[PDB]
Design a protein around this ligand. Structure first.
Ligand SMILES: CC(=O)N[C@@H]1[C@@H](O[C@@H]2O[C@@H](C)[C@@H](O)[C@@H](O)[C@@H]2O)[C@H](O[C@@H]2O[C@H](CO)[C@H](O)[C@H](O[C@]3(C(=O)O)C[C@H](O)[C@@H](NC(C)=O)[C@H]([C@H](O)[C@H](O)CO)O3)[C@H]2O)[C@@H](CO)O[C@H]1O
Length: 192
């Protein structure tokens, strides 16, 4: 339902920094597990990230967590969103691509130009998708109308791009994909 899609992207998320993930696999699924305050978080890993993490112990990770499920032990489950922590040390954002939002209005389309500040060298598609939708829900009335063919496009300096179709959740198998934050040129959204 459209309201479940909205409530997903309006919900809580957290960025965990410099954590050590332990790799394993069960039933043909691949995971990274970590612990904090005597509690576990299990992250499912997808795509070719499955062998970028090919060692048991993986220090120095950043994880973007969106709770998908939680059990009685309080173990939280989330999909993808694992990146390497920054090698640099920064005092402000490292890139500020324009976010060009074309919003349908009465009798036309109105283009708003915003910035989206990037603080990470390696950024997951999961994090960008989630944060950009949440911003559009809060500020540009995303999901107050049915989204139809609405999309977000992230365009890289070399001309490569990534597309987020707004009529459904980001596909789980894409939630491990990572891009270089320094190389994003611009982002576009067309909103109903
Ligand atoms: C069943 C399923 O979940 N399949 C996933 C693919 O999605 C399915 O097929 C596509 C063609 C659409 O019909 C989807 O609705 C459908 O679920 C998924 O394919 C990717 O889908 C997205 C849109 O959802 C998009 O079309 C992808 O194409 C690009 C893009 O615009 O994002 C094309 C770009 O040139 C390419 N960029 C670069 C630099 O290569 C990107 C990039 O590869 C991906 O964005 C990375 O995630 O893709 C289309 O590939 C497929 C791969 O993401 O995952 C399937 O599990």
């Amino acid at each position: 339902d459209i309201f479940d899609l909205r409530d997903y992207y309006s919900g809580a998320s957290k960025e965990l920094k410099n954590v050590t993930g332990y790799r394993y696999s069960k039933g043909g699924k691949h995971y990274l597990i970590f612990d904090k305050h005597q509690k576990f978080t299990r992250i499912q890993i997808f795509g070719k990230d499955i062998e970028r993490l090919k060692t048991r112990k993986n220090p120095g990770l950043d994880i973007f967590v969106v709770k998908e499920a939680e059990n009685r032990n309080g173990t939280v489950f989330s999909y993808g969103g694992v990146t390497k922590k920054n090698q640099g040390a920064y005092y402000d954002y490292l890139n500020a691509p324009k976010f060009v939002i074309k919003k349908e209005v009465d009798a036309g389309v109105y283009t708003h130009v915003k910035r989206h500040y990037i603080y990470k060298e390696e950024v997951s598609l999961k994090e960008l998708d989630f944060k950009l939708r949440q911003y559009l829900i809060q500020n540009f009335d995303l999901y107050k109308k049915f989204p139809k063919d609405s999309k977000i496009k992230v365009i890289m300096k070399d001309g490569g791009y990534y597309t987020f179709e707004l009529n459904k959740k980001l596909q789980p198998h894409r939630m491990s994909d990572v891009i270089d934050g320094r190389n994003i040129e611009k982002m576009e959204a067309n909103i109903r």
